[PDB]
């Protein structure tokens, strides 16, 4: 069962058969105990990450399949083992950051979330540093500024859920940081990119979750300029 998924994920499947099995896998990972998830383990993770990389790296079912993986990832990581095992990967943090394509906003939402939750993790470390480095890594791959995908998601046309998502990741990248000069440096690089013009707009919006992330962004911004 755990083992047949892996076998199937290593079998060269494509398109709807891939989608369908990923969907199946998603429920499996969601409904099953943590022992089944270890059974699926790093070998299972690695095969999801392998297909993900192939989809990221190529260009009808691509977006959906990338998304369904990102969904499978959420489930795998809904326990300690899965969190540890993702963070043990060479490339998995990076393949999440690469899932933040403003053109596919709901997978971006799901990927931004999981990155934000890594950032606020009690153990490991500064996982925010690890996420930034991955964003750096991605920026020169795609030849864009590193915080640009995030500012693209705060654009006026996009869904409130995405807006919330991006601002929430900004907040997860900054809050956990111990250095003031790092924090203000990040804040400042974002404002250079056009964040100040967007906050004006975001601050009009009717949403409680949006109001919450703006409150966090503002209050920490105040206290930092006050400290400095």
């Amino acid at each position: 069962s755990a083992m047949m998924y892996i076998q199937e994920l290593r079998s060269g499947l494509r398109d709807m058969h891939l989608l369908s099995c990923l969907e199946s896998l998603r429920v499996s990972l969601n409904n099953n105990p943590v022992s089944w998830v270890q059974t699926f383990g790093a070998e299972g993770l690695a095969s999801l990450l392998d297909i993900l990389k192939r989809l990221h790296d190529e260009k009808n079912y691509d977006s959906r399949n990338q998304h369904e993986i990102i969904r499978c990832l959420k489930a795998f990581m809904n326990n300690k083992f899965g969190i540890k095992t993702m963070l043990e990967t060479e490339e998995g943090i990076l393949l999440l950051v690469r899932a933040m394509d403003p053109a596919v906003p709901n997978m971006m939402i799901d990927a931004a979330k999981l990155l934000s939750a890594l950032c606020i993790l009690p153990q490991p470390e500064d996982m925010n540093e690890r996420v930034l480095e991955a964003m750096t890594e991605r920026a020169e791959m795609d030849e864009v500024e590193r915080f640009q995908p995030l500012l693209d998601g705060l654009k006026s046309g996009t869904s409130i859920a995405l807006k919330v998502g991006c601002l929430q990741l900004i907040n997860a990248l900054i809050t956990p940081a111990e250095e003031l000069d790092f924090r203000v440096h990040i804040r400042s690089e974002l404002m250079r990119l056009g964040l100040h013009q967007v906050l004006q707009e975001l601050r009009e919006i009717e949403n409680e979750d949006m109001k919450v992330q703006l409150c966090v962004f503002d209050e920490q911004g105040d206290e930092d300029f006050f400290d400095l």
Partner: peptide, 20 residues
Amino acid sequence: DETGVMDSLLEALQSGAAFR
């Protein structure tokens, strides 16, 4: 052995408690 770990983190983010 307990699930819903990610689920705890997503909720602390969403409300604002995480920050901190």
